[PDB]
Amino acid sequence: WDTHAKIERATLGGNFRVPIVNSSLVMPSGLTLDYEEDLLYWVDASLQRIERSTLTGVDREVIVNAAVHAFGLTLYGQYIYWTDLYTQRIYRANKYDGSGQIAMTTNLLSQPRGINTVVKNQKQQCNNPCEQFNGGCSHICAPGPNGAECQCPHEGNW
Amino acid sequence: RVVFDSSIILTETIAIDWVGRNLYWTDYALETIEVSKIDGSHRTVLISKNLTNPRGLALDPRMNEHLLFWSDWGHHPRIERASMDGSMRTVIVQDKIFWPCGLTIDYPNRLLYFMDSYLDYMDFCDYNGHHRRQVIASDLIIRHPYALTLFEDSVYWTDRATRRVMRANKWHGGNQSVVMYNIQWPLGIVAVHPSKQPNSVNPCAFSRCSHLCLLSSQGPHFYSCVCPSGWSLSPDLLNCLRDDQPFLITVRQHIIFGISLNPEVKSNDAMVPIAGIQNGLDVEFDDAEQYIYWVENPGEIHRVKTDGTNRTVFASISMVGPSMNLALDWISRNLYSTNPRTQSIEVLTLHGDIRYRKTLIANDGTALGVGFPIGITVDPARGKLYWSDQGTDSGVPAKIASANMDGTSVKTLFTGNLEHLECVTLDIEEQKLYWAVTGRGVIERGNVDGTDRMILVHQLSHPWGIAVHDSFLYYTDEQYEVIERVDKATGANKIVLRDNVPNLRGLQVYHRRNAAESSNGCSNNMNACQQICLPVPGGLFSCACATGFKLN
Amino acid sequence: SISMVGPSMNLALDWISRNLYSTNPRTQSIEVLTLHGDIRYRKTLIANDGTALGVGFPIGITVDPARGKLYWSDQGTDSGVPAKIASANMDGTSVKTLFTGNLEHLECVTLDIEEQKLYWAVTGRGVIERGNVDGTDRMILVHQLSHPWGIAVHDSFL
Amino acid sequence: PDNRSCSPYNSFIVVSMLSAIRGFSLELSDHSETMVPVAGQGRNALHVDVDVSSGFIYWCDFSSSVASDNAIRRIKPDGSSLMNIVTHGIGENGVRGIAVDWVAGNLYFTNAFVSETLIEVLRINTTYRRVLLKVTVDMPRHIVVDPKNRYLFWADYGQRPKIERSFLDCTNRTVLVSEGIVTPRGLAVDRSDGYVYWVDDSLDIIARIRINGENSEVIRYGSRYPTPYGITVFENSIIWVDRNLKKIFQASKEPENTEPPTVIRDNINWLRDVTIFDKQVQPRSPAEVNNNPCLENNGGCSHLCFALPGLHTPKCDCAFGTLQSDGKNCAISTENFLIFALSNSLRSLHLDPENHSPPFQTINVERTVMSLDYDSVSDRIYFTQNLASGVGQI
Numbered sequence A: 001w002d003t004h005a006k007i008e009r010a011t012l013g014g015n016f017r018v019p020i021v022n023s024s025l026v027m028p029s030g031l032t033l034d035y036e037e038d039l040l041y042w043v044d045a046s047l048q049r050i051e052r053s054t055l056t057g058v059d060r061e062v063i064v065n066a067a068v069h070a071f072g073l074t075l076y077g078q079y080i081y082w083t084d085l086y087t088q089r090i091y092r093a094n095k096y097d098g099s100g101q102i103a104m105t106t107n108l109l110s111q112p113r114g115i116n117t118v119v120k121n122q123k124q125q126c127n128n129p130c131e132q133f134n135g136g137c138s139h140i141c142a143p144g145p146n147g148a149e150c151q152c153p154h155e156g157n158w
Numbered sequence B: 001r002v003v004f005d006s007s008i009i010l011t012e013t014i015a016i017d018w019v020g021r022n023l024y025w026t027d028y029a030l031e032t033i034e035v036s037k038i039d040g041s042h043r044t045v046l047i048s049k050n051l052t053n054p055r056g057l058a059l060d061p062r063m064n065e066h067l068l069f070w071s072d073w074g075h076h077p078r079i080e081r082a083s084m085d086g087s088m089r090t091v092i093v094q095d096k097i098f099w100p101c102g103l104t105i106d107y108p109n110r111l112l113y114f115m116d117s118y119l120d121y122m123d124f125c126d127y128n129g130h131h132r133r134q135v136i137a138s139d140l141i142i143r144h145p146y147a148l149t150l151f152e153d154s155v156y157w158t159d160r161a162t163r164r165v166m167r168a169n170k171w172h173g174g175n176q177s178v179v180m181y182n183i184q185w186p187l188g189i190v191a192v193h194p195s196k197q198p199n200s201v202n203p204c205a206f207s208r209c210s211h212l213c214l215l216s217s218q219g220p221h222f223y224s225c226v227c228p229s230g231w232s233l234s235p236d237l238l239n240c241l242r243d244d245q246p247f248l249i250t251v252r253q254h255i256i257f258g259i260s261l262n263p264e265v266k267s268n269d270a271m272v273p274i275a276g277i278q279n280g281l282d283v284e285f286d287d288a289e290q291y292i293y294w295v296e297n298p299g300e301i302h303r304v305k306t307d308g309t310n311r312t313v314f315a316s317i318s319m320v321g322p323s324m325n326l327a328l329d330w331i332s333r334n335l336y337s338t339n340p341r342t343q344s345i346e347v348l349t350l351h352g353d354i355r356y357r358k359t360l361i362a363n364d365g366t367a368l369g370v371g372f373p374i375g376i377t378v379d380p381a382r383g384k385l386y387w388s389d390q391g392t393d394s395g396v397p398a399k400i401a402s403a404n405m406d407g408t409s410v411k412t413l414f415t416g417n418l419e420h421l422e423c424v425t426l427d428i429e430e431q432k433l434y435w436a437v438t439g440r441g442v443i444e445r446g447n448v449d450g451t452d453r454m455i456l457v458h459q460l461s462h463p464w465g466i467a468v469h470d471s472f473l474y475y476t477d478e479q480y481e482v483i484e485r486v487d488k489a490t491g492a493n494k495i496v497l498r499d500n501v502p503n504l505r506g507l508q509v510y511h512r513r514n515a516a517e518s519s520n521g522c523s524n525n526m527n528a529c530q531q532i533c534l535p536v537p538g539g540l541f542s543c544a545c546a547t548g549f550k551l552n
Numbered sequence C: 001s002i003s004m005v006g007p008s009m010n011l012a013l014d015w016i017s018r019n020l021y022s023t024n025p026r027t028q029s030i031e032v033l034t035l036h037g038d039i040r041y042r043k044t045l046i047a048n049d050g051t052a053l054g055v056g057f058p059i060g061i062t063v064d065p066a067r068g069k070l071y072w073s074d075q076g077t078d079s080g081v082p083a084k085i086a087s088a089n090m091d092g093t094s095v096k097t098l099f100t101g102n103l104e105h106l107e108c109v110t111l112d113i114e115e116q117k118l119y120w121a122v123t124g125r126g127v128i129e130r131g132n133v134d135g136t137d138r139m140i141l142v143h144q145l146s147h148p149w150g151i152a153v154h155d156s157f158l
Numbered sequence D: 001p002d003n004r005s006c007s008p009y010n011s012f013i014v015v016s017m018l019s020a021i022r023g024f025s026l027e028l029s030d031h032s033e034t035m036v037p038v039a040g041q042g043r044n045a046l047h048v049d050v051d052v053s054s055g056f057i058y059w060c061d062f063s064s065s066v067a068s069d070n071a072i073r074r075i076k077p078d079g080s081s082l083m084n085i086v087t088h089g090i091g092e093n094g095v096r097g098i099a100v101d102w103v104a105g106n107l108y109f110t111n112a113f114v115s116e117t118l119i120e121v122l123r124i125n126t127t128y129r130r131v132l133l134k135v136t137v138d139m140p141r142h143i144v145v146d147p148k149n150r151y152l153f154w155a156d157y158g159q160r161p162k163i164e165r166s167f168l169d170c171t172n173r174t175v176l177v178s179e180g181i182v183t184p185r186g187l188a189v190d191r192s193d194g195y196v197y198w199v200d201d202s203l204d205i206i207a208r209i210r211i212n213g214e215n216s217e218v219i220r221y222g223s224r225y226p227t228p229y230g231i232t233v234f235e236n237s238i239i240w241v242d243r244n245l246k247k248i249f250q251a252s253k254e255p256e257n258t259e260p261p262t263v264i265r266d267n268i269n270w271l272r273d274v275t276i277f278d279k280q281v282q283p284r285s286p287a288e289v290n291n292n293p294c295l296e297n298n299g300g301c302s303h304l305c306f307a308l309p310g311l312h313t314p315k316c317d318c319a320f321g322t323l324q325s326d327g328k329n330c331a332i333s334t335e336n337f338l339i340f341a342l343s344n345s346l347r348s349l350h351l352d353p354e355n356h357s358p359p360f361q362t363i364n365v366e367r368t369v370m371s372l373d374y375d376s377v378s379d380r381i382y383f384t385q386n387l388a389s390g391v392g393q394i
């Protein structure tokens, strides 16, 4: 949320802190990831728009153009769900384009802050390299890309 | 410059018939679609029935269509089409409509575009409504659209909620754009371009219509003549002759209407209805000049002709002073008024240019004065003035008193059982007085000599206005919200002229003054008095002088 | 208090049966309250039942505990109840209109038990009239008054 | 009858004029107040319904200015036990109708928002509360319940006004009256004869219609009856309040009668609604209610019991979660759903818009929470409750 807001991406161990998107972003919020399609979705309250992008950030499409203080966001199935601070309700739209912008709930009494999906069903399962003897780590282990990535306590110098 | 001198209010939309050189508009206050020439010569209610909240208008004056469209967002919202003469009224679209705020026409394609401010869509359909397509739907771009515009392949609509005019494609709404960002109230929008108005042959250019010519979908002439309010079309169908039948001048709060005395006609267009008034209480009419006098706050009297022309402030409190109720002497050209602040009865001279007003009867402390006059009526021929007073606790009792029209020889005709006494009217033909007692909820009757007091009508909640014409007694009850007619002899045959009319008030029948009995002392001796002439019983005229001056 | 007993405007106390008769301004009705005992019981005796024998706007109320008669003055209402000096039994039954007419701005009414006569003040006429408890012998006792408010009769004096 | 003893009133009409709720005896010669009037600050009683068996009088308060005044309350006739039944979730337009199912102990009310209306049901003396219906085009405002016939009638005076009949769970919606009705301000059900009376102040008409459509006849009409605002049917008479006339009339309920109405009270201002408080109009014997399954133990349902016509078994619903295979117990939904964090609570929403029952009951949390993450393994939802501006907490 600092000046020139960036979508900073790295591994679970933070190996390569590369900002995916840094232009045309004021107050990013509600980051969501299209696991099935490998896409990055987010909203910006100041921009009042919902945009999607590739994991690298080459592509950038504004899924939803009209919104009122859209703050939260989540994705599931072929639909994308977000919350508005102004109207105080949860909407829904098609993740591909956003054609079916309807209201999922009435005018909630307070402002809905964050919306998430409870995947009771199988989530993004992936064999954990950290399972085997903490992934060859004497300390904390973070399963990043291409094998485990060991982590160390921040309190001590390691 | 302003097209209409009269204050036509709540004109939600305006549509211009360039082919016919006519102006169409919808009056929300009157809930009617009114049409007039572009200058404003003859304004006429085109559609009145089955119309509650007409917002959004459209015209297709091209020779092959001559059609009219409007959208109503009241009870059972719909979009209707009728020929520009007012005939052939059909409801083209009545489904999936909640608040049809906007409406426009694409003349080349023959598609009419409309929007809903509640369902938040922008659809278009053919003239018959058979083929319907959605341009923008289930989109947060449209939140509270009001007006629409269509230049070429671009649709521009104004949203009151977002305070920004927006543009997109007129077939799929993809190229969304923001023409303007911050508008306090965008409301209507019009695309000014000659292509928007296709030129066509005007049949009305060579018509023989006397007052108004309007394009009609019906052939072979494809036009029809229209009559202004209060006029009747001759069978020749090209000349309109003025109607002369009397009608009830029903006065309500914020509006005054003209209701035809025939109960069959349910159209409130016996005259051009006055609008924009504040707390209208009573009304008087000048038959000879076709004027209508009414009093609105603060204590000020306005006049307008029966055709909605020359609406001015006849007399102000600055020059004339406050006035509440009126009673016009059509013979001697004197307007008798009741002063609320001073609690007195006055007279104002209509004749001449200078307005002279004097106080005739004032509260002198005796029981024969005026305590709190509510209704006043006059008989110019006999030179008698009759008024109703609610009385005061100072000693003046609630009474129906009488006096000569010069303020002399007062007497108490009737008294007792006059609680909450309302306005009193006089039947000149029978010399009987009709007054409404709210406290008893009755309409009583008595002679002008204080004899033969009878209860004409029973079981009323809050009767307000009384008018007697021919053999019928017309009265209005505020709580019942009804205008009812009974026989003035016995009050038996009750007929409901209007019902569910909120904020009813007093009324007077707009009858033709008896030309035979049209002479008194002042009429026979005009210019005898320097400032004010007042008729007195016996054909004798008594000169009086205005406030601040004394008779020599 | 209004919390337990409810609103009351004018009073008339029965010193024999320990009952306090009141006039309710909000409900436009005549009530009675039990002074005797610890618990306060109040009931509405006469209410505006739509007939001309109800209570429209009672201003003054007086009681005669010995004869079991209740006399009150009502300014009436535009609904149909006329300005009257009515009478009833002290249980709220057998109402009747003793006097009517010329009672504009009718003020409080007092009862002279010794002579069984009613004294009331009519502000509108500016007089203090007198009549019997049986609706007979109505006479004007005092003339030329501006706004007479209270009336009390003791011994031979008014 | 002994002329010495005192007993509480058992049969009277409760009028609901906006300032205060007062009761009157049906006997015209009796002028006593049949209940302790309910008045006070912020009293705006739109409608009143009564539960005779439990001896309670419900009403819906509405106040545009103050949100805390909008509530559904109840009190006994002696004015002793006052408790706010419903205070949270009330829309911007407030509760616009109350129907009390004395047989099943379910309170139906029409929550009204700016642009939508919810026909909710609450099981009395519990916390279960379910939104039976969520509608936008229609505007159900006043609602009345007929447990004996297992029907639920409401009135709509919005665009396309109508009177609708539905099952006790609002499923089989049918339009009883769609024409000749403009502003059905007030609705009542004749329990004995299976008629649905209503008053329309816009058309100045008092009419009735049998529950299964069919006969539709006008009881009263004309220039009189300018604004009937609320009606109730007792024995062979209808009691209705007229706002303009300030009177509580009473007339024979059967049509074609011409006798003038009897006036119970006069000069009362701001009349809104009237209902009858009598044991006759709310029978509870099993034979009287056509063997309503929800009569006993809430029909065995854990959350909510609804008696549908024909189905002798008590259909059970869930205020939250889903109904299990047993048909009488509710557990957490096993399908994927949304979780969203409101300022003071964490809630859940099904993916299907039609299903309104939350996957799990709302959990109230600290002053402010700004994110949600759920760990199925441990069946817990992480949330960053920001207790104060500076006091953050996971």
Ligand SMILES: *[C@@H]1O[C@H](CO)[C@@H](O[C@@H]2O[C@H](CO)[C@@H](O[C@@H]3O[C@H](CO)[C@@H](O)[C@H](O)[C@@H]3O)[C@H](O)[C@H]2NC(C)=O)[C@H](O)[C@H]1NC(C)=O
Residues within 6 Å of the ligand: D053, D054, D055, D076, D081, D105, D123, D124, D125
């Ligand atoms: C919700 O809880 C309230 C309070 O407990 C219940 O009110 C109670 O209802 C019962 C049954 O109607 C009442 O019993 C009755 O008492 C009267 C005398 O007061 C008696 O004549 C009857 O035969 C019967 O025994 C009880 O008094 C009443 N108590 C209060 C405080 O009102 C209400 O019924 C409960 N409702 C539900 C949905 O469970």
Ligand SMILES: *[C@@H]1O[C@H](CO)[C@@H](O)[C@H](O)[C@H]1NC(C)=O
Residues within 6 Å of the ligand: A134, A138, A139, A140, A141
């Ligand atoms: C993490 O914390 C747990 C509990 O204190 C401890 O058993 C464990 O060794 C720590 N480190 C790792 C690598 O899990």
Ligand SMILES: *[C@@H]1O[C@H](CO)[C@@H](O)[C@H](O)[C@H]1NC(C)=O
Residues within 6 Å of the ligand: B049, B050, B089
């Ligand atoms: C208005 O509606 C009534 C009732 O449907 C109908 O009889 C009448 O013909 C309609 N008039 C117009 C002008 O549509």
Ligand SMILES: *[C@@H]1O[C@H](CO)[C@@H](O)[C@H](O)[C@H]1NC(C)=O
Residues within 6 Å of the ligand: B169, B174, B175, B176
């Ligand atoms: C307008 O919309 C069309 C159809 O979606 C699209 O092909 C075109 O690129 C858009 N152009 C603009 C200016 O957005």
Ligand SMILES: *[C@@H]1O[C@H](CO)[C@@H](O)[C@H](O)[C@H]1NC(C)=O
Residues within 6 Å of the ligand: D172, D174, D309, D310
């Ligand atoms: C539901 O309503 C329809 C009429 O709309 C009716 O035919 C049907 O029988 C009802 N439900 C039942 C009881 O099957």
